[PDB]
């Protein structure tokens, strides 16, 4: 489960999630799973998807995770009122914009990569599409 080893600060402003992604090309492998939708991916979702695709390829080839969950998300416990300070960090997310390549794969047939990424995509809260590396 991915998490920054250290951070300058513990807690982060909510912020917003506008714009299109940077890192829209298959840069490392042959095939990629690209976000079409916008949202947050939790570290648990990233891990569930990783485990699904890794099992599907039977640990052949190579997988890259292009996203990293570096945004801490706080929550207030049950039965506490509003205010009294910001809540405690509970989990970590990556912000996803449309176009973001989430995962890449190499050293497998396309057919197997497509199946592996279909199984992974079913773990994710964002719509995705299969992409292939391009020359330009």
């Amino acid at each position: 489960m991915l998490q920054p080893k250290r951070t300058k600060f513990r807690k982060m402003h909510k912020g917003r999630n506008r714009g299109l992604a940077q890192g829209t090309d298959v840069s490392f492998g042959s095939f990629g799973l690209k976000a079409v939708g916008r949202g947050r991916l939790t570290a648990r979702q990233i891990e569930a998807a990783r485990r699904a695709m890794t099992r599907a390829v039977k640990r052949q080839g190579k997988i890259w995770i292009r996203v990293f969950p570096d945004k801490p998300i706080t929550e207030k416990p049950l039965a506490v009122r509003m205010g009294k300070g910001k809540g405690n960090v509970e989990y970590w997310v990556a912000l996803i914009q449309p176009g973001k390549v989430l995962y890449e794969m190499d050293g497998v047939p396309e057919e197997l990569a497509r199946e592996a990424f279909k199984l992974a995509a079913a773990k994710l809260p964002i719509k995705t599409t299969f992409v292939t590396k391009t020359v330009m």
Binding site: A21, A35, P98, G99, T134
Partner: protein
């Protein structure tokens, strides 16, 4: 080899470019050499099919614009962030 039919663009900038792409065309630019850059508009589906061939980026191409044949290489392509579409192509005279 690769014959691209193009027209010179009448309007430029964001408004004009988005209107082109809504009408199943896309903007492009020819530069290089010494003659000034030529802003052109291409048919989307035609070029999208051509550039699926790997030799589109390697080999010299011909852009037939206003009758004139201009010989060029593909220098850069801007793809749509998630759809299988072309936003823009840079062609260098070559």
């Amino acid at each position: 080899m690769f014959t691209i039919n193009a027209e010179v663009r009448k309007e430029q900038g964001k408004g004009a470019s988005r209107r082109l792409r809504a009408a199943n065309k896309f903007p492009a630019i020819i530069y290089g050499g010494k003659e000034a850059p030529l802003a052109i508009e291409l048919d989307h589906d035609k070029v999208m099919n051509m550039q699926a061939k790997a030799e589109f980026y390697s080999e010299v191409l011909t852009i037939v614009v206003d009758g004139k044949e201009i010989k060029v290489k593909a220098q850069d392509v801007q793809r749509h962030p998630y759809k299988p579409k072309l936003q823009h192509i840079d062609f260098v005279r070559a």
